[PDB]
């Protein structure tokens, strides 16, 4: 994997490639690594497919039960539930999860949860095997309070490079936009992003 | 760590008649769960009416056959074009194999031909050079499937004369080339059914005083 | 005893009625890092042979030098170096095969899988494989690495046995090869979009095609795929 | 220390015209040492016959277990268990011990009393049902038995002919296996008579 | 532990068991009786892992004696052997299995027949005319195959047994300090003092 | 494998089985575990097959070169030591060998040398080597005497292999007999164990455990 | 194993080969890898044979009880959820690799499950040892808006690729078609391109060939 | 290490950090990883300090002896000698060397030699542990026929990011300019590059 | 191999060596002489790895016999022991070392004194009144410490030696099939046939 989430003026955008590997074989070239735990709280999944999937499902269950009793949960609350599972089961899990959500009070927020189960709230976050190749690029090019079109270009260009260098990353670039307006899914094919 | 050996699969079979001998072998070549070739022969005419096959690790098998072929050539140069007898070829091959006792050729070797009395002869080798003349031998991946069938049908093992209270054995007799080829074809089709590394094609080399003839038959390709 | 560092992936090939086709992508991988992108892994020897190499690139470059040196050595004291006593595909292969097996027998192999494609002086098609173990085999279609698992099934639908070779044209054969290269780009995690292709014909000779690209790819269906099961949006 | 080849042994089953045959060797050993030449590996519960190869303590234990279960089956159902049903019971029982299995290679054989159809089946140690029209093999000489059966077998053999085919399959397979042999037994099973024959074979 | 033999003849079962207990480079004892009486007409010899052997033998002995008192009746050798086998069959899949091999020699008073059962630590039971555990079999079995007849007397059985011990004393690497011999018949169990 | 050889009044008896196994798989029932070094010397196979074969064939070449140079038959002691010194050079490399070098000369009389891949060289009267050696020892020890007849000695060796062929799973096939005299060895035929077992069972009354 | 699943116009089709192996030996030449979870939800299984059968039956049993409890036809996502949560719990030790497909009130569906408990969604999928041979065909010939007859052709072609090119797959092709508004049709042995050729000889023995020691009637009655 | 070499209009520039590590301890914070094998043929050293040093010395000896007999060697020739040592002793070496030189005919040239001992002629090359973080950046920002000032900024910005993310890299940024004019050494301190 | 003992008394050196040759679970021979005569008044017993023992013993024997012929003179026991030690001292750092332990019993004709040397496979030489190799020492040494006197006769030495063999036969795990006893004195080397 190459995954990232970036806050901006109107909210937050999640981004991911679509490659799933079993060794050097691509088991799925059209994977959807961006998953919904709540209406406007989503996560990017990296590491073990089975682990991250099981975790996300449990979180979705917890936040559904939270909503039934206490109304809409904060993005921080969602990240806390992710942490709780990842930290307490650190010996049996291989999951690198980025949590991103949109409140109306707090606007866009991004929390990254690495292998250990620690939590880190950031303006933007990158993760997965392909993220190593774009630390330099992302750091130089990220700005706070970007527009929607700028943030889409930032993620597109970043993941394009991550895909270019990482063999474990590829396929289409999926994105999910989280704003007050609603939820918007975007897709970008090789013929476009490769020649950026 | 680098592993110098591999398994190319396949299986071979040698039967000896009264005035002839056959050496059969399937034409499939494999590594792991992949087919490399559907027709890659591993039974070779080496001259002087000697046919040979070295089944197991193909690289070692090809090396050995190549060396023995060369051994036959230099036997002619050094001993006034004298014909290499099947028994002499067998002993020579032992020295080739045992020459690499501590880094062996990973192959079960079988040669076939006629002895100096004109009678059919099959010799079989272990990887390091031990050899023995026999009427019958299967080698390779499906050897364990084919060999007990040969014991029963070629050497008539466990077969007693009907009505003799299991006291008189079924008498040993030479088989015709027609009868032998039937057993070869049935052996390989049976082996093809139950062994994954056996199939594609069957190539038989028959050895009589007149020379070396070939026959080819299709096998199941799954 | 070695371990491969900079590596090249699948080499695929097949026979057709008048000659042979061979192809290989232009990537030099460094583990999961797709390090080098201008790597030519098809190397012509004369005007009648193309050697396709996968595996370790340092060892590939060594083999390049050997072949280059073989052409020089053959030309020495040889008035018929560009005629009857030119290098045949069968000679070039047997040389490499000898080397590969000698190196494995010294527990210091050239970490490669090699396919020698060419046309002999009498017009016959030549196509044979050899690898780090010294293992050799020939077939109407040959492929290394992932190609063995994915390309061969596709190429064997065109030429399934010997009798299918005269019935297969260069147009049909090249189409199958180019299709196989696309499938490998979909599914092999250490493959690139850019590749080279070589045709050795008994009439038109050696045609070497550089800077080809995989195209006509199906990705549009990806937009409909959402989540991994119970997810709708 | 490979449980499936400490004691040794083999079982084979075949179908014929309105009949079935099941056969086994008599050897029980401790690796190289031959200990007993009377160890039968075929049992029966009513008209349903079960052969079991593998680790001998588990062979004995499972026989005792299936006798236990079929006896309760009969008391509650008020009828004998059929081969198809028994096959399912064996599979269930083996898979129950999925991560601590009985090291065995069972073989069910029998004729359904209602339909009259000949039935045979085999299993792996973990319960996977292998049903077959022609033959089932099991034991340390399974490769050999596969080779013998696949060549010697033909469909719709008469009981007297089927006896010769299964017997020759077992004998010649056993003689190419060090851990099998030391005597043999063959069961010929018809709709309402069962003949048991001890074969004369080489005792090495 | 090490050498335990057993021979079933016409009218009795004879068990021979070595007297040595070695621990280390030292023979700690040379008069050890490797057997327990399970019931008046049933005897069990044992060999295997130290401690486990006696612990197991006595545990079985207690259970059979408990059965005898409860039912005022002696279990048949076949019944006792089946009980012992099941206990070992449980044991092998335990956390720590008993590593004990046994021979059960008994006289069935209902059948008026002697019976010899050989059971290994896995729970592998077989009825035999003659039996052995450990390396002993590798010498004795072939010797008995040759010299054993099914209609032999107790005296003939003892001579046959002497022939086995002599062979073991000649070819076995370890000094096992002779054997204690015990006979099981219609009149119960008795020990041969001069062997 | 089971092989034996013992000294007696009439010379030496050598007896061997014929089975060869690769794990549980019986590779051959017709193997020759007696090597005919020369018309006066014999050697037995146990352990490595190619090794025994290769090096005792080689031994025969060394014995022939000896009697060409020395114009005299090689002693059993000298012949056995040529082999033991050879395998000792290869010690550690992994040779597998357990053999009885058997012969009958004027100066020595009947002589048997056990030679080993560990380098062991032992002169002796009775030897048994192989997986089924212990079974053969049991019959030999209880029946051996120096004043056996050539007829009774041959049978004892045959019966001892049969004993092992029966019990030892890695022995059987057939029994090869040899009788070594001062004028050379004499072959006494191949005897199938399948037929021999029933023959012996009936005539001798033995193997009552087995049903026939 | 080779198994595939292909979506089409008004439903979904799955297919599978019929070979079962222990090592290099073909244990079963005609086993059934297509499994019924509910009437209109079928499963193709690769990996540990007993596990794919046991896990498909357990979930199938619970799906039936659920369908009775809710008075509703079962959904594919319910079987998918129950399977993956079961497989995840056992951390891959239950070696079941499944292709789950079917029709339900929600529509037509196609999923894959791996032993460790990860699930995928797709229009065309392949699992097992011959999944690369199958996927090569699927990637070459698949398109959007396939008809029923086109999807069966594509699916069986993908299985054939595995049958011929993969040594872990062989024998026959089983197919199951699940169309919306219709009964699911299970096509056992839809193709049988590996029929054994006539043997060269009959090995029927003369009666009395086998030596017999004892005879006895066995009592099966009470 | 973070090292790189970049061709441009007037020739070629080599660049490197100055950190040498023995575990997490910095054994030398002012290392000179840019070494002279000939007047206008230099190399960047990454991997084992002892190995790369021994190799460079042997190459310097070979090129000195080459010059005595056949005059100035080509940059390709220098790279060939490096390869020959690295390839033939691949089992006993851990050396990742970038060779860069200036001919008057061939202008600026860059050859990279990874672990295996393969040779790759490139417009620019990056290597060492810290290079992984700047594949994305360097690919997006490199242009052919840059000026001296542009190439210096390209290397400075690139290595600055490599240093920022890689713990195994740091200290000063050394550079060596190879043109027809001659050889120029440049140095850049943390206070400058860190705040780029 | 296994048990080799040695006792130096007033006028002689006595070497006792076990007769068994065990190979696996079989005692292949029970009359093996584990000694070689190096010179008329020097005897060397040996125990250790199979093959190595005899090969080493005979190699030393050849060298000493070669010296005797060349100089027409017998080397002193001290000189022979020093030669043997150096050979073992070389051996231990070879590619494949001799794994052989030896006792050298000899009578120095110039000093008119018996001498006993104990040398292990590493080349560790010591002159002793009584010596042993392997596990034998663990029983015999303490026994000799108690009963040994320096002025004993050959007959007293043999009785002392009988006392050792009896203790070994009682407490040693393995059957070593008795010992061959040899005496070295002013008149040379002779074997005791009835022990
Ligand atoms: C990129 C491709 C590599 O890191 C991503 O992290 C990707 C994340 C992803 C994949 C699918 C759906 C959502 C998100 N990860 C994978 O594709 C993952 C690679 C991986 C496997 C195991 C790991 O440690 C336990 C770490 C990374 N692939 C898988 O999980 C595949 C489907 N299954 C296997 O590789 C089988 N594994 C199971 C675990 O044990 C080893 C064998
Ligand atoms: C192809 C044939 C793989 O070669 C398929 O995956 C096939 C799937 C199948 C077969 C029948 C019914 C449903 C599905 N798999 C097999 O046939 C399978 C291959 C296999 C063997 C061993 C494995 O080890 C983890 C995994 C897969 N064969 C079996 O399961 C056979 C019937 N049983 C055994 O080999 C016994 N094994 C089972 C695993 O536990 C150890 C003992
Ligand atoms: C960065 C710091 C890390 O890769 C560079 O590659 C740097 C290159 C360099 C250093 C000095 C001068 C010129 C160029 N490499 C190191 O600093 C190097 C780290 C390294 C050590 C060993 C390696 O594999 C054999 C690979 C990388 N540091 C050293 O060599 C230091 C001086 N010595 C040790 O760490 C001791 N090593 C010796 C080799 O065996 C392990 C212990
Ligand atoms: Mg196939
Ligand atoms: Mg036997
Ligand atoms: Mg170094
Ligand atoms: Mg830093």
């Amino acid at each position: 994997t190459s995954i990232m989430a970036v806050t901006f003026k109107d909210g937050v955008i999640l981004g991911a490639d679509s490659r799933t590997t079993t060794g050097a074989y691509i088991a799925n070239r059209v994977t959807d690594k961006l998953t919904r735990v709540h209406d406007k709280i989503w996560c990017c999944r990296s590491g073990s497919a089975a682990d991250t999937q099981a975790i996300a499902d449990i979180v979705q269950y917890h936040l559904e039960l939270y909503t039934s009793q206490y109304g809409t949960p904060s993005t921080e609350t969602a990240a806390s539930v992710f942490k709780e599972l990842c930290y307490e089961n650190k010996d049996n899990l291989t999951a690198g999860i980025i949590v991103a959500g949109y409140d109306d009070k707090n606007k866009g927020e991004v929390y990254t949860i690495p292998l250990g189960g620690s939590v880190h709230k950031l303006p933007y976050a990158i993760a997965g095997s392909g993220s190593t190749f774009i630390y330099g690029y992302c750091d130089k090019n990220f700005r706070e309070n970007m527009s929607k079109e700028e943030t889409v270009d930032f993620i597109k260009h970043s993941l394009s490079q991550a895909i270019k260098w990482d063999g474990s990353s590829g396929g289409v670039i999926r994105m999910v936009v989280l704003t007050a307006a609603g939820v918007e899914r975007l897709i970008f094919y090789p013929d476009e992003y490769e020649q950026l | 760590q680098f592993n110098p050996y591999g398994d190319n699969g396949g299986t071979i079979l040698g039967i000896a008649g009264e005035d002839f001998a056959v050496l059969a072998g399937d034409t499939r070549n494999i590594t792991d769960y992949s087919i490399n070739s559907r027709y890659e022969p591993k039974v070779f005419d080496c001259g002087d009416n000697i046919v040979m096959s070295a089944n197991g690790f193909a690289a070692d098998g090809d090396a050995l056959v190549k060396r023995f072929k060369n051994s036959v050539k230099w036997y002619h140069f050094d001993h006034n074009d004298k014909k290499l007898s099947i028994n002499s070829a067998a002993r020579n091959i032992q020295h080739l194999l045992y020459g690499k006792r501590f880094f062996p050729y990973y192959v079960h070797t079988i040669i076939a031909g006629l002895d100096e009395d004109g009678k059919g002869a099959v010799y079989s080798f272990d990887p390091v050079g031990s050899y023995e003349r026999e009427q019958c031998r299967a080698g390779g991946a499906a050897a364990s499937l084919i060999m007990p069938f040969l014991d029963n049908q070629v050497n008539f093992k466990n077969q007693y004369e009907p009505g003799t209270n299991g006291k008189v054995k079924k008498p040993l007799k030479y088989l015709s080339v027609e009868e032998v080829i039937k057993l070869v074809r049935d052996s390989f089709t049976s082996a093809t059914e139950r062994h994954i590394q056996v199939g594609d094609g069957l190539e038989i080399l028959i050895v009589t005083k007149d020379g070396v003839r070939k026959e080819f038959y299709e096998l199941k390709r799954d | 005893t070695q371990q491969p560092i900079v590596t090249g992936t699948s080499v695929i090939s097949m026979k057709y009625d008048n000659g042979v086709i061979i192809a290989a992508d232009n990537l030099g991988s460094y583990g999961s890092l797709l390090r080098f992108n201008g790597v030519e892994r098809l190397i012509p020897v004369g005007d009648n042979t193309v050697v396709g190499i996968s595996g370790d690139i340092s060892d590939m470059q060594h083999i390049e030098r050997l072949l280059k040196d073989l052409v020089t050595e053959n030309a020495y004291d040889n008035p018929l170096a560009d005629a009857e006593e030119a290098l045949e595909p069968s000679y070039i292969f047997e040389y490499l095969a000898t080397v590969m097996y000698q190196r494995r027998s010294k527990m210091n192999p050239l970490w490669n899988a090699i396919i020698v494609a060419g046309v002999q002086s009498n017009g016959d098609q030549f196509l044979r494989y050899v690898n780090l173990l010294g293992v050799t085999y020939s077939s109407p279609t040959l492929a290394t690495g992932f190609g063995a698992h994915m390309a061969n099934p596709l190429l064997r639908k065109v030429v399934d046995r010997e009798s299918d070779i005269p019935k297969t044209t260069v147009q049909v054969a090249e189409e199958a090869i180019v299709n196989a290269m696309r499938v490998l780009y979909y599914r092999d995690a250490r493959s690139s979009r850019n590749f080279s292709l070589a045709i050795i014909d008994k009439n038109t000779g050696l045609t070497f095609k550089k800077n080809l690209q995989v195209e006509n790819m199906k990705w549009d269906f990806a937009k409909d795929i959402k989540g991994y099961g119970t997810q709708k949006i | 220390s490979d449980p499936s080849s400490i004691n040794g042994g083999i079982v084979v089953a075949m179908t014929g015209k309105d009949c079935v045959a099941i056969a086994c060797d008599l050897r029980l050993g401790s690796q190289s040492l031959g200990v007993s030449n009377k160890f039968e590996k075929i049992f029966h519960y009513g008209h349903v016959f079960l052969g079991i190869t593998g680790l001998a303590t588990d062979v004995t234990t499972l026989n005792e277990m299936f006798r236990y279960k079929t006896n309760l089956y009969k008391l509650k159902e008020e009828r004998a268990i059929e081969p198809e049903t028994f096959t399912q019971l064996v599979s269930s029982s083996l898979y129950e011990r999925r991560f601590g299995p009985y090291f065995v290679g069972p073989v069910v054989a029998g004729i359904n009393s209602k339909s009259g159809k000949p039935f045979i089946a085999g299993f792996d140690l973990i319960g996977c049902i292998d049903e077959a029209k022609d033959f089932i093999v099991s034991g340390t000489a399974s490769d050999q038995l596969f080779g013998m059966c696949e060549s010697l077998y033909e469909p719709n053999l008469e009981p007297e002919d089927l006896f010769e085919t299964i017997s020759q399959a077992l004998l010649n397979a056993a003689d190419r296996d060090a851990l099998s042999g030391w005597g043999a037994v063959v069961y010929i099973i018809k709709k309402d008579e069962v003949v048991k024959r001890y074969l004369k074979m080489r005792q090495d | 532990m090490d050498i335990i033999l057993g021979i079933r003849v016409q009218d009795s079962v004879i068990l021979a068991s070595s007297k040595a207990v070695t621990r280390g480079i030292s023979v700690l004892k040379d008069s050890d009786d490797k057997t327990r009486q399970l019931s008046p007409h049933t005897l069990m010899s044992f060999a295997g892992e130290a401690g486990d052997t006696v612990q197991f033998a006595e545990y079985i002995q207690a259970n059979i004696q408990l059965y005898s008192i409860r039912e005022d009746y002696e279990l048949s050798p076949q019944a006792v052997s089946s009980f012992v086998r099941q206990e070992l069959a449980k044991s092998i899949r335990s956390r720590r299995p008993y590593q004990v091999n046994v021979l059960i020699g008994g006289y069935d008073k209902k059948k008026n027949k002697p019976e010899l059962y050989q059971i290994d630590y896995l729970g592998t039971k077989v009825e035999l005319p003659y039996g052995a555990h450990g390396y002993s079999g590798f010498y004795t079995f072939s010797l008995l195959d040759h010299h054993y007849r099914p209609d032999m007397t107790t005296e003939e059985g003892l001579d046959l047994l002497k022939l086995c011990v002599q062979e073991l004393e000649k070819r076995m690497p370890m000094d096992f300090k002779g054997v204690i011999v015990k006979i099981v018949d219609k009149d119960g169990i008795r020990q041969v003092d001069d062997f | 494998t089971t092989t034996l050889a013992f000294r007696f009044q009439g010379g030496i008896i050598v007896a061997v089985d014929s089975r060869a196994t690769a794990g549980n798989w019986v590779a051959s029932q017709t193997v020759k575990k007696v090597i005919e070094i020369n018309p006066f010397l014999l050697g037995t196979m146990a352990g490595g097959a190619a090794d025994f074969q290769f090096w005792e064939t080689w031994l025969g070449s060394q014995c022939r070169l000896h009697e060409l140079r020395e114009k005299e038959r090689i002693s059993v002691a000298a012949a056995s030591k040529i082999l033991s010194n050879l395998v000792y050079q290869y010690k550690g490399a992994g040779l597998s060998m357990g053999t009885m070098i058997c012969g009958y000369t004027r100066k020595e009389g009947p002589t048997i040398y056990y030679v080993d891949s560990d380098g062991t060289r032992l002169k002796g009267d009775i030897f048994c080597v192989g997986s089924g050696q212990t079974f053969a020892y049991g019959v030999l020890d209880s029946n051996y005497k120096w004043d056996l007849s050539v007829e009774d000695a041959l049978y004892l060796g045959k019966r001892s292999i049969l004993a092992a062929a029966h019990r030892d799973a890695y022995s059987g096939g057939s029994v090869n007999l040899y009788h070594v005299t001062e004028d050379g060895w004499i072959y006494h035929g191949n005897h199938d164990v399948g037929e021999l077992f029933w023959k012996v069972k009936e005539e001798e009354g033995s193997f009552n455990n087995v049903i026939g | 194993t080779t198994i595939v699943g292909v979506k089409f116009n008004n439903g979904v089709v799955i297919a599978a080969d019929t070979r079962s192996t222990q090592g290099p030996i073909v244990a079963d030449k005609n086993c059934a890898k297509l499994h019924r979870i509910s009437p209109k939800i079928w499963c193709a299984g690769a990996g540990t044979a007993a596990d794919t059968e046991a896990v498909t039956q357990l979930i199938g049993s619970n799906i039936e009880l659920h369908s009775l409890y809710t008075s509703r036809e079962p959904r594919v996502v319910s079987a998918l959820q129950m399977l993956k949560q079961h497989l995840f719990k056992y951390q891959g030790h239950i070696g079941a690799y499944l292709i789950v497909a079917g029709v339900d009130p929600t529509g037509s569906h196609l999923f894959s499950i791996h032993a460790h408990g990860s699930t995928d969604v797709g229009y065309y999928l392949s699992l097992g040892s011959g999944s690369l041979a199958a996927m090569a065909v699927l990637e070459s010939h698949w398109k959007q808006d396939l008809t029923k007859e086109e999807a069966i052709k594509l699916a069986s072609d993908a299985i054939q690729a595995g049958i011929w090119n993969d040594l872990g797959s062989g024998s026959n092709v089983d197919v199951c078609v699940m169309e919306i508004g219709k009964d699911a049709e299970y096509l056992r042995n839809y193709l049988t391109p590996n029929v054994r050729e006539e043997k060269q000889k009959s090995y029927k023995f003369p009666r009395g060939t086998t030596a017999v020691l004892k005879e006895s009637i066995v009592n099966i009655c009470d």
Side-chain angles (χ1 to χ4, degrees), chain E residues 22 24-30 135 138-139 168-177:
Chain E
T22 318
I25 56 161
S26 290
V27 180
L28 297 175
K29 198 175 174 181
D30 63 9
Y135 295 120
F138 284 86
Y139 287 103
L168 293 165
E169 283 179 351
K170 182 164 172 65
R171 297 294 181 182
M172 280 276 163
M174 80 300 175
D175 190 343
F176 60 90
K177 306 295 186 190

Side-chain angles (χ1 to χ4, degrees), chain B:
Chain B
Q1 219 260 271
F2 171 63
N3 170 217
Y5 294 111
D7 184 357
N8 292 113
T11 196
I12 50 167
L13 151 59
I15 300 168
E18 193 179 349
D19 66 329
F20 72 96
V22 297
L23 211 196
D26 64 331
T27 63
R28 174 176 278 178
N29 188 294
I30 67 97
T31 38
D32 298 328
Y33 274 66
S34 282
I35 296 166
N36 298 329
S37 176
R38 295 196 187 278
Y39 184 74
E40 183 67 27
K42 66 203 175 219
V43 186
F44 302 99
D45 187 349
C46 300
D48 293 12
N49 260 226
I50 300 162
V51 291
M52 176 174 176
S53 183
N55 188 241
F57 178 44
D60 277 358
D62 285 345
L64 187 68
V65 168
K66 200 160 177 176
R67 282 226 292 164
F68 173 68
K69 277 189 174 178
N70 188 234
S71 194
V72 173
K73 194 188 186 192
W74 279 97
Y75 185 82
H76 293 317
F77 286 147
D78 295 330
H79 305 91
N80 197 232
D81 277 320
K82 180 180 175 173
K83 195 196 180 187
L84 184 67
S85 51
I86 195 78
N87 71 285
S88 293
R91 179 66 70 79
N92 174 235
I93 290 166
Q94 172 169 77
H95 280 83
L96 293 175
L97 292 161
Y98 201 84
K100 279 171 61 61
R101 169 63 176 76
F102 304 111
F103 183 30
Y105 289 113
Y106 258 50
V107 284
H108 290 141
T109 316
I110 299 175
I111 63 169
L114 304 171
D115 69 358
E116 283 160 306
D117 291 318
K119 286 185 174 153
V122 167
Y123 287 78
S124 62
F125 306 75
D126 81 349
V128 280
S130 76
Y131 74 94
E132 179 203 6
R133 191 185 172 176
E134 290 166 305
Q135 279 292 123
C136 225
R137 174 62 70 187
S144 61
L145 286 77
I146 297 167
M147 198 62 198
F149 171 72
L150 272 30
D151 291 339
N152 185 230
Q153 296 298 315
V154 180
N155 294 323
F156 306 131
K157 296 284 178 71
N158 294 113
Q159 287 198 249
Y160 290 91
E161 204 86 58
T164 61
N165 190 231
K167 218 98 289 198
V168 175
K169 300 173 78 173
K170 189 170 192 267
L172 302 172
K173 65 161 180 284
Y174 286 112
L175 287 81
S176 58
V177 68
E178 288 78 22
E179 268 293 319
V180 168
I181 288 173
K182 284 180 184 174
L183 293 169
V184 169
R185 287 186 69 179
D186 280 348
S187 290
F188 270 92
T189 49
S190 296
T192 302
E193 287 286 301
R194 293 289 179 178
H195 206 103
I196 65 172
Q197 304 177 341
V198 178
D200 294 328
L202 171 59
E203 193 165 74
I204 308 167
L205 273 72
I206 309 96
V207 183
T208 59
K209 59 170 167 67
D210 292 7
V212 182
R213 186 174 77 265
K214 284 178 196 166
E215 285 182 24
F216 178 80
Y217 297 102
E218 295 272 315
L219 295 177
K220 282 173 62 167
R221 294 156 70 89
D222 68 341

